[PDB]
Design a protein around this ligand. Structure first.
Ligand SMILES: CN[C@@H]1[C@@H](O)[C@@H](O[C@@H]2[C@@H](O)[C@H](O[C@H]3O[C@H]([C@@H](C)O)[C@@H](O)[C@H](O)[C@H]3N)[C@@H](N)C[C@H]2N)OC[C@]1(C)O
Lengths: 58, 132, 178, 143
RNA sequence: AGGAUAGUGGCCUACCAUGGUUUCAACGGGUAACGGGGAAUAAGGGUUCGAUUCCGGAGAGGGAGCCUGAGAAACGGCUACCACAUCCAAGGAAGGCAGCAGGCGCGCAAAUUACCCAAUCCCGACACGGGGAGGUAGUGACAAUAAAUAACGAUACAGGUUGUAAUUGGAAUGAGUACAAUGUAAAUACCUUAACGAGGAACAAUUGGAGGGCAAGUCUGGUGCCAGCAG
């Protein structure tokens, strides 16, 4: 159960390649700050102190 | 169209036989005002001749419209020729450009001449009898 | 050689990069006043901190101290002429109570959407950038341009803009062909 | 009390005493001995260049088990031999024997890092191009 | 006491005396030491940096010796030696970029063999000439300032009076290009500006992270103490 110099790049080389999915652009500058402000302090999703910024789709 | 001109901070300069002032130009719906047109309008306002008028260093304000600069009214035309730098007269068409080679060529020429003691005639003849 | 020209930095980043409470506070301020980044909040924080420091240093002194009588009143004059203070708080004690919103309210962008020249504060900034706004008869395209109390009533549109007595932009001039 | 003199004409004793005991602090002692100039492999520089002599794998220390890919490097400025870690998955294949690499410190100002014993440097560039560019296929290995 | 110097002085000479410095650190050694005005950090007290825009000193490959001149132990002056380096018809002759630009080398590490005396100012017999001093442009993500990359409507939605939704339109404009004038010594750029100049407004923002310190996933696939991550 040893590694070796011959095993260099194993996991990356055998990783199944997946291309990016074409998605719309994200607004830059003041518009992005506007967007984040609307997410968090305008269209609230709070429920008794559960405010996950990155919930898992489920 | 409708170009208003004003002067401020006026100095009379008998020492240089002229009059010094700062020009203020109001030209709505127009990019700027040419220096020759400004000179003619100034000559008309002050009944002086155009070839005794000087305008330089004009700067349009931010956004547009108001522009500013400097103006010089020489009391004659000989005084204009006598107290005016060559480049401004060349701009005005009053004077011609002095003809000369590039600065590097002039310097190289000068450094070749330092090689010779005397006149070019003697050096040329000596080289002639030096070769053939 | 020629003498060096002075230059200074006008802001400072926070000592703790990830305090969540103040992150939310900065996001609220940017959203309320339509800012572009967090550095615009940092600049007003810088200005407010130095103003409060100056007021505190002067307030260490007696009411009869000449240095206070000169510099504190100059500071009060500058603050009350820009709109941060009113005509009833000239004592350097109300200088200590100023908050970033006091300066944010006196920006060009805030006053443009307050007067009515634009609907949203974002639309106000967007008009300011495209040179549709003139203070006096001077076009200003700087949203952080701070308007003084004797400048608030002269904000309006520019004579050459399509919103204040101008011609049509390229879009309308191409769309009027038919 | 307090074991230090307090007399108002005791400035010499206080100053000399502080000067003697500052030698017990590592940073002061290093900057006054000039150890970076005299004994550091980089001679006090932040980065250094060298020629790769050999690829070596180094066993990670406990409680880890791995082979950390590194290269033995001979520096150009002084001819010193140092070992540098080549950081990322498969980036050892980008470097070869006789290549010219740029080395940097390894983050802890002369100390080893993590579970890698005896390695105090990392490869930044090989053949004049960064490893981060090569790993991400943002550039190409020159030839 | 004399000599020498522009002049004082062991500065040097002759004669004479035995003095001078030192644990309150002399003397010697090191400095990856030119000094200061200053810089960063900064409760206070401190710690560290200052080759470098100004001031003072020193040098012109290394030493030494001089001419001229009011002023130099001058090096874009001379003489000699050492070391480098050039031409040659082999007898001989010519050198000093730590000035500007440029090359080689060195290295982690730093730009054009450009334009000009218009400005600052200096020099001359001089109102006129000269000035890589200086200024102008080129390169330039050292550092610093401001500041785009989108804005607003209506349908269907919806919510509990608009805070929220896709698809439906019309405007707004500066990046860019270009008459023009302006800017300039002549240019370039800025600024003003005619004609152009936006739907994927593809005119498409990146750099690092997502266990804790420390803000943000136990979502999916791959690998299986390997490969790799990790201050
Ligand atoms: C070889 N390491 C030396 C270590 O030996 C020690 O040196 C001391 C030195 O500081 C002492 O010296 C010290 O103390 C004397 C005091 C006694 O008067 C002071 O006068 C002197 O200025 C001061 N440097 C010296 N007398 C003995 C060395 N071993 O501390 C300094 C050091 C560099 O770390």
């Amino acid at each position: 159960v040893h590694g070796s110099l011959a095993r260099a790049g194993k996991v990356k080389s055998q990783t199944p390649k997946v291309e990016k999915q074409e998605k719309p652009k994200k607004p830059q500058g003041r518009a992005y700050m506007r967007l984040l402000y609307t997410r968090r302090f305008v269209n609230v999703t709070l429920t008794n102190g559960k405010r996950k910024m990155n919930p898992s789709p489920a | 169209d409708a170009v208003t001109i004003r002067t401020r901070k006026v100095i009379s300069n008998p020492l240089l036989a002229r009059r010094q002032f700062v020009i203020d130009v109001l030209h709505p719906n127009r990019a700027n005002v040419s220096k020759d047109e400004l000179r003619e309008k100034l000559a008309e306002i002050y009944k002086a001749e155009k070839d005794a008028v000087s305008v330089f260093g004009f700067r349009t304000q931010f956004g547009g419209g108001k522009s500013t600069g400097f103006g010089l009214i020489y009391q004659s035309v000989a005084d204009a020729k006598r107290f005016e730098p060559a480049y401004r007269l060349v701009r005005y068409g009053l004077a011609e450009k002095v003809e000369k080679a590039s600065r590097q060529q002039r310097k190289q020429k000068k450094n070749r001449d330092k090689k010779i003691f005397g006149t070019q005639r003697r050096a040329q003849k000596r080289a002639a009898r030096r070769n053939a | 050689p020629r003498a060096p020209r002075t230059y200074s930095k006008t802001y400072s980043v926070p000592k703790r990069p990830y305090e969540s409470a103040r992150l939310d506070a900065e996001l609220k301020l940017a959203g309320e006043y339509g800012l572009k980044n967090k550095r615009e909040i940092y600049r007003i924080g810088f200005q407010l901190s130095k103003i409060r420091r100056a007021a505190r240093d002067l307030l260490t002194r007696d009411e009869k101290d000449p240095k206070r009588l000169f510099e504190g009143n100059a500071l009060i004059r500058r603050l009350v002429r820009i709109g941060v203070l009113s005509e009833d708080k000239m004592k350097l004690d109300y200088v200590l109570a100023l908050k970033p919103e006091d300066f944010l309210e006196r920006r060009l962008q805030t006053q443009v959407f307050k007067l009515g020249l634009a609907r949203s504060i974002h639309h106000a900034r967007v008009l300011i950038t495209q040179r549709h706004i003139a203070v006096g008869k001077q076009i200003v395209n700087i949203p952080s341009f701070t308007v003084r109390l004797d400048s608030q009533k002269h904000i309006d549109f520019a004579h050459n803009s399509p919103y204040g007595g101008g011609r049509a932009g390229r879009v309308k001039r191409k769309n009027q062909g038919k | 009390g307090k074991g230090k003199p307090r007399g108002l004409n005791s400035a010499r004793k206080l100053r000399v005493h502080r000067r003697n005991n500052r030698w017990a602090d590592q940073a002061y002692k290093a900057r006054l001995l000039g150890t970076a100039f005299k004994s550091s492999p980089f001679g006090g520089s932040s980065h250094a260049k060298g020629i790769v002599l050999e690829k070596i794998g180094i066993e990670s220390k406990q409680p880890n088990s791995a082979i950390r890919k590194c290269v033995r490097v001979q520096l150009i400025k002084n001819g010193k031999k140092v070992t540098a870690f080549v950081p990322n998955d498969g980036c050892l294949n980008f470097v070869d024997e006789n290549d010219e690499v740029l080395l940097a410190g390894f983050g802890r100002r002369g100390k080893a890092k993590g579970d890698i014993p005896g390695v105090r440097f990392k490869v930044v560039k090989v053949s004049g191009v960064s490893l981060l560019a090569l790993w991400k296929e943002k550039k190409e290995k020159p030839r």
